[PDB]
Every structure is written in structure tokens, then in C-alpha cells.
Amino acid sequence: GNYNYLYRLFRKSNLKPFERDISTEIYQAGSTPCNGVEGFNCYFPLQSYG
Amino acid sequence: STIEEQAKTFLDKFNHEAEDLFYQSSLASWNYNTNITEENVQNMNNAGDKWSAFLKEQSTLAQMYPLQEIQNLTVKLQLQALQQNGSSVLSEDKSKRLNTILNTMSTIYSTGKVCNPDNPQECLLLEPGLNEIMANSLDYNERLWAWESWRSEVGKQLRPLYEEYVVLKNEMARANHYEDYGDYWRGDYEVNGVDGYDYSRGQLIEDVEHTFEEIKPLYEHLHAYVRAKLMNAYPSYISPIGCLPAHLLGDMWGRFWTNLYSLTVPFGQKPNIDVTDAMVDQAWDAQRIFKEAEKFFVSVGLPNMTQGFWENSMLTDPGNVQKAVCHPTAWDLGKGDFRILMCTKVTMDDFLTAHHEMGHIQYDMAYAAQPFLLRNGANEGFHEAVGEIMSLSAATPKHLKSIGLLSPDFQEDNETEINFLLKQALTIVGTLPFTYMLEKWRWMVFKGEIPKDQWMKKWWEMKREIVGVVEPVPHDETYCDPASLFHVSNDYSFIRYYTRTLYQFQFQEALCQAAKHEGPLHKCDISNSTEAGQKLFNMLRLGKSEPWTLALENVVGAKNMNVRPLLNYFEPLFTWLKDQNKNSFVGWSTDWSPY
């Protein structure tokens, strides 16, 4: 299985046409603040493919 | 902000993180089943443990999300399927005790022993032993002896443990806000949220009883016919008023009566529909069988196969060069890798089994464009019925004649049709009353309607009232009789087969009516059609995304479980049974005993 590829799965906003960003901020859906790790409403933006 | 977006995000993350683990577990299981070594089974066990730990962690994380404020039906169903507590409701000590009980029961049921006296050992296994002993015998004493010995050897070691087993099961059921374990099993068919197509938990029992009330005449006629045949064969071991013996059913448990067709065949002097000679004369192999199956499925309307199905499946038994279990299973890795594991040879039974496996693969590929929590059948009976209806439809002689197996010059007499109907009834209708009795007994023993000291007392009387089988020797309470089967001794559902049987006839009737065909149903063809295939594909792609009550009407039309298709199918056999049993007595009495 190949796992060298990653992709963005969740973010607060979408992407504009011809836009490229390498920001890897954690997504926060709920009102609970995220300190830098995952949890209830904190998730990691990058996900390894297969 | 809202909870629905958080739930959808968590579900998508769970699917994306669990698909890879499921694929790895499937690959490990495939490597184990195709190569019996130590590293393969070690990797399989490691993958299974990692998958179980990940599933438990995800369930504990999802239990924090409520289930009332969920407005989406699919999200609610996925949350209900993910937040399943399982055995976590009990303490650690109780959990490990239940696991040890399950393991020791599995080992006891798998080892097997006979150990006949007067001989040095005479201790054989289960399948190469009691199965062939009670399946290929023509004597009355040896079958009774083997049945009694096996039942006693099972009871004397499973009686003190079955009480603790059912107590732990009732405790685990009540710890999850369920009234009993039978209710926990019936909750799989329960659907909520959608109005107009709901289905209560108690309605299933009423529907099963209503179907059994109409199945009763056919079962009584079949029992009368079997009793007449036994009286014509054995004039001193069966009475026209009593029930049938227990050890003369051709099976250890009396579930399948396939071995009874060879002794109760009406037209044994006439040839059968076996096309083995035509296959071995035209130089057939395992590849051409799957080729013809793919041609049939693509003529019905099913799409083609993937490029990995024909390069990864083991269509040839390697033999003694390497160990490989020859057991037909439709493996679904979840990431487009579909392959069949079966040592298919030149045999009509192997042909039907390959058709069944290909139907299962097609059913799995139908809802392939769905999340991981939705790539599964609606209930525990549709997934097998969809595969069995293709085999039941392909069993027609006209299909084999059109393919090239059966020669064009072939008679269409009614004797072969009656023989085929009787052979199908001995393996389909014969197991329905036993299944119903076992399911009712398990429900009443898990709910509390049966006293603890009256388990066997209720079992041996339900075996005579509901089923037309009487034991040749009374058994005390120390013999754990009802737990002699494989599903009850390993915690597996048994009503799934009954639901599959009641649904396969409906599916066959729907596919025959949608193909613009008229006449008898036993010879109705499904291939070379464009409406039936589309109607089937429109329903197989639903999966868990829609309730089964709403999905049933999209392929048939009815909104409930009906049995009329079974009556319409067995009418040519029901009339023949009425004509043959007109001079003989119909029914059985619970007063007579072969003691």
C-alpha cells in the first residue's frame, strides 16, 4: 500500500480557482477551543492516502 | 457550530481511517486462507486486534455525540451502528469469563469424539464421523445409538455451562436497555425516524406467526408424505398416527433432509438432470464455468468484473503442494478488490456454488459507491438471498440447454419436475419448522417465559407439537439437548435463514413477473431480459442507506413479509402431495411414542 500521498479533507473555507496553500492548521468545528491536538471537535487537516 | 456538521466530519474521518484497516485485515485473512503458515496467522491476529482496538476507541469517541438532535437519517443510522456497546457493558471479569466460556465451548464443539466401546479407540471426528454415519446408513439401531451417544456426550459437558451462558447473555442484554437477548437480536430489523414505513420489534414475531400459519398445510402434507414413504420402506419402525423418528432424518440435528431424497424418490427409475457427463465430455474446466457465469450476469444486466478479479482469485486447487482451505466465500476487501475463494471443479453443485459466489460479488459491488458504514446489506437475510435467487433461477434445465450444457433433444415430462420440486422442498421446506421452533425456544428462554428447570421439558414437547419429529428415547434434564447445534453453541443468529427463505421466493416471483413471463414459476427464466435486471440493480445499490421496509417495495411492491410467492411456487407440488396423500392420513398426534 502506498501512503506517501496526503490531501486536505476538512477546512473552515473552500479554495479559490488557481489557489495553492500549504497551511496545516487544525480544523475546529465546535465552539470548544483547540490547543494543538485532536479531541472532541479538533481534527487534523492532512490525511494519508492509500 | 451545529452538531450535524461535527457528526458528519467525525463520520468521514472514521471512514477514512477505518477503510485502510479493513482492507489490511481482509488482505491478512486472504493470505492466511491461501497460505497456512505461522507468520500469516500472526499478522492476521495482529490486524484483527488493531481493528478491534480502533473500533472500540471510535465507538467510545462517538458515544459522546447525542442521537436525538440528529436530523439526518443516514447519519443517525451510522451513529447507531458505530455507538454499539457490545460486550463493554459488563465488567472486565465478567467479560473475560464470557470469552473463556465461548472459547471452551468452541473448542469442545470443534474437537468432537465418539469413542465407541468394545474397540480400542473408535474415537472419530465430527464430520468424517457422525455425519457420514447418519447420512450413509440403512439401519435403525446404529443411527439411534450414534445420536444418543453424541447427545449424551454433548449434554454431560454443556449442561452446567449453558445456564451460566444464558445468564451472562441475559445480563448483557439487560445492561444495554434491552428487555431480553431475543429483543436484542430482533432490533436489527427495527427502523425508526422515517414515518410511514416503520417496523416495530414486536411486529416481526406476529409476521413470522402469520407466515407459519399458512406454511402449516404444506408442512403437514410433506410430513404425511414422508410418513407414508417410511411406512412403505420400514413397516415396523413408524406408525400412521405417531410422529417421525429423530435419528432417521438424515442429519444429526434434523435441519437438512437432503439425504432423505435418495430413499424417498418417487421416480428413481428415471434419470436425473445431472449434466456432469456433458461437462466432462465437452472438455470443461473451472475457467469456462466462471466465463459462462459472467456471460449470464452480463446478459441479465450486471456490469463486468474488475481486472483484479481474474488475476487474484484462486480458481484452481493447488493440491498437496500447499495448504489452502477450499471453502466458498465472497471476500470483499472494501477498496475495489473483489475476488472469490473457491476450489471450483467440474460439478453441477460447484457450478451453482460459483453462481452464488458471483451473485454475492455483484451484490457487494452494487453499493460500492457508499461509505464504509453503508457498504453492507440492509439485514442479515438479504445479503444471502440475493445470491441464492441467482442459483435458484440458473437451476432451470432450459438455461443449461441454452448455454450448451444440456442437449437440445430433451424431454419435458412432469416426473422430473415433481422430483425437482420434492428435492427442493426436502431442503427448503423441511428446515422452516425446525428453525421456527428453535428460534421460539431461544426467544422464550432468553426472555424468561420458560422455567430454568423445564428447558428440555419444553424443548421435547415443542419438537412434537410444532415439528413432526418424536424422540425414540426420553432424556432427563441433565442432557443439554437444545444446545447441540452450531449456531446456538457459537452465538450466531438462526432466524436469518428463515428470513432469507421467505424473501428469496418473493424475489424470484418479482424477477419472473418483471421479465414479461407467464406460466409456471419452477421453469421461469430471468436471463435475456432488460427490465428485471434494471429493477434488480435499482434495489441492490441501496444498501444501508434506506430502510428495508422501504427497499422491499422497490423490487417487489409489498411493504411486509409475505409467503404467497412460496405457495404459488409449490402449488404444482402441493397439488401432487394432495393427490398422493388423499388415501392416507394427514396429521400427527403427540400421544403416540416409538418407545
From Swiss-Prot, chain A:
Changing F10L: In strain: Omicron/EG.5.1. Residues 9-44 are annotated as: Disordered. Residues 1-50 are annotated as: Receptor-binding motif. Changing E38D: Increased replication in human TMEM106B overexpressing cells. Changing E38Q: In strain: Kappa/B.1.617.1. Disulfide bonds join C34-C42. It comes from the Viruses. Changing F40P: In strain: Omicron/XBB.1.5, Omicron/EG.5.1. Residues 2-10 are annotated as: Immunodominant HLA epitope recognized by the CD8+. Binds to host ACE2. RBD also interacts with the N-linked glycan on 'Asn-90' of ACE2. Cleavage of S generates a polybasic C-terminal sequence on S1 that binds to host Neuropilin-1 (NRP1) and Neuropilin-2 (NRP2) receptors. Interacts with host integrin alpha-5/beta-1 (ITGA5:ITGB1) and with ACE2 in complex with integrin alpha-5/beta-1 (ITGA5:ITGB1). May interact via cytoplasmic c-terminus with M protein. May interact (via N-terminus) with host bilirubin and biliverdin, thereby preventing antibody binding to the SARS-CoV-2 spike NTD via an allosteric mechanism. Attaches the virion to the cell membrane by interacting with host receptor, initiating the infection. The major receptor is host ACE2. When S2/S2' has been cleaved, binding to the receptor triggers direct fusion at the cell membrane. When S2/S2' has not been cleaved, binding to the receptor results in internalization of the virus by endocytosis using host TFRC and GRM2 and leading to fusion of the virion membrane with the host endosomal membrane. Alternatively, may use NRP1/NRP2 and integrin as entry receptors. This is Spike protein S1. It comes from Severe acute respiratory syndrome coronavirus 2 (2019-nCoV).
From Swiss-Prot, chain B:
Residues 1-589 form the Peptidase M2 domain. GO terms for biological process: angiotensin maturation; angiotensin-mediated drinking behavior; blood vessel diameter maintenance; entry receptor-mediated virion attachment to host cell; maternal process involved in female pregnancy; membrane fusion; negative regulation of ERK1 and ERK2 cascade; negative regulation of smooth muscle cell proliferation. Regulated by chloride and fluoride, but not bromide. Chloride increases angiotensin I and decreases angiotensin II cleavage. Inhibited by MLN-4760, cFP_Leu, and EDTA, but not by the ACE inhibitors lisinopril, captopril and enalaprilat. Highly potent and selective in vitro ACE2 inhibitors were identified. The lineage of its organism: Eukaryota, Metazoa, Chordata, Craniata, Vertebrata. Changing D337A: Strongly inhibits interaction with SARS-CoV spike glycoprotein. This is Angiotensin-converting enzyme 2. Changing R174D: No effect on interaction with SARS-CoV spike glycoprotein. Binds 1 zinc ion per subunit. Binds 1 Cl(-) ion per subunit. Belongs to the peptidase M2 family. Glycans are attached at N35, N72, N85, N304, N414, N528. The gene is ACE2.
